Amino acid sequence: NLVIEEYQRKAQLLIKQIRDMRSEHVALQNQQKLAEKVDRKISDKDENI
């Protein structure tokens, strides 16, 4: 019982965590593609500081 039940407990936890992270990654990878349009003034920064 302990092996068959705990294998299900530990697997169902990871089956959630990796599905949750598989959606958060996709949110971040779209927010990133908003900033990629704006920043073209990196080399200016430390001079203008």
Place this chain on the structure above:
Amino acid sequence: RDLTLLQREERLRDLIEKQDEVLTPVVTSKDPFKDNYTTFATALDSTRHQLAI
């Protein structure tokens, strides 16, 4: 990380450009004000080197 650091250097450049516009006029006015004002100060102080009787 990288999306938070970019948002920090974003706001750093915004806070810089909002000063640079206003610092540049003041700097272009600096020493031609200073040297007139120092000439005025020493000339004005000469009016106080004179004890009343």
